[PDB]
Amino acid sequence: DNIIMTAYISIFVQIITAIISVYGLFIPLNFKDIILREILILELIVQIIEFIFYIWLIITLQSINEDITYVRYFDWVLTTPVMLLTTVYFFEYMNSDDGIRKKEINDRDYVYLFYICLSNFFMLLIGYLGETKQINKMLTLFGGSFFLFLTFYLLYVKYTKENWMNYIVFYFMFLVWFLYGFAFMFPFSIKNQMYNILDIVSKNIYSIFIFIVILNQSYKLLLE
C-alpha cells in the first residue's frame, strides 16, 4: 500500500513543482542571473525522466513478481549527472561576482565535470550490481559510499567557498544523497518508500529552491 501511496504523493509534488518551475522561466531577470533559467530547464528535463519512471512504477506495482528497485537506476544514470551539473552551475552563480553561464563553465571545466560524472557513474554501477544481487550488500555500501564521497569531494574542492551559504547548500545536498545509500540497507517496501520521498527532496525541493532564488533576484530588479 505504502509504496503506491508515496508514489502518488511524489507524482503530486512533481506536478506542483513543474508548474512552479515553468512560471519561474518567464520571471524577468538581469542578464547576469539567466543561468538560474538554464538550471530550471535542466531540472525540468530531469522531471520528464522522473515522471516516466513514477508512471511506470504506479502501473507496474498493481502486479509485481520481483524486487523492481533496480529499475530506478535507469532513471538515476540519466538524471544524477544532470543534477551534479546544475549543482556546479548554482555554486558558480553563488560564488561569481561576475555574470557566468553554463557554456563558459562547460567549456572551461569539461575535463573536471567529466570526472565528477565518472565518479557518480561508478557509484551507480556498484549500487546496480548490489541491487541485482551480483555483489553482496556490504561491498555495495562500501564501494558506492567511496564514489559518493569522491563525487562530493571533487565538487567541494573546486566549486565551494568558505561561508555559511556554501556549507548549507553543499552539506544538505550531501546528506540527501547519502540517505539513498542508507535506504539501500532496508527491505523492499521500506527501501522504496524512502526512495519515493528522497526523490521529492533531491529533485523537486531543489527546483523550488532555484525558483525562490529567481523570485528574490526578480524582486531586486523590480525594486531597482
Author numbering: 2 to 225
Provide the authors' original text about this structure:
Phylogenetic analysis shows that, within the rhodopsin superfamily, viral rhodopsins form a monophyletic family that consists of two distinct groups, VR1 and VR2. Here we present the results of a comprehensive structure-function study of two homologous proteins (61% sequence similarity) from the VR1 group, OLPVR1 (ADX06642.1), and VirChR1 (TARA-146-SRF-0.22-3-C376786_1). In this work, we demonstrate that VR1 rhodopsins are Na+/K+ selective light-gated ion channels that are inhibited by divalent cations. VirChR1s have proteorhodopsin-like architecture with short extracellular loops and share several structural features, such as membrane-associated ICL2 helix and an unconventional TM6-TM7 orientation.
Type B hexagonal crystals were grown at pH 7.0 using a monoolein (MO) lipid matrix, have the P1 space group, and contain two protein molecules in the asymmetric unit. Type A and type B crystals resulted in the obtaining of the OLPVR1 structures at the resolution of 1.4 and 1.6 Å, respectively. OLPVR1 molecules are nearly identical in both structures (root mean square deviation (RMSD) less than 0.2 Å), so hereafter, we refer to the structure from type A crystals as it has the highest resolution. The interfacial interaction in the putative dimer occurs mainly in the TM4 helix and involves several non-conservative residues, namely E108-E108’, Y111-Y111’, F122-F122’ with low surface interaction area (429 Å2). Strikingly different from other rhodopsins, the intracellular parts of TM6 and TM7 helices of OLPVR1 are significantly moved apart from each other far enough to form a pore. The pore is located at about 8 Å from the cytoplasmic side of the lipid membrane border and connects the inside of the protein with the groove on its surface, which leads further to the intracellular bulk. Surprisingly, in our structure, the groove and a part of the pore are occupied with a fragment of the lipid molecule, a host lipid of the crystallization matrix (MP and MO in case of 1.4 and 1.6 Å structures, respectively), which is likely to be a crystallization artifact and is discussed in more details in the Supplementary Notes.
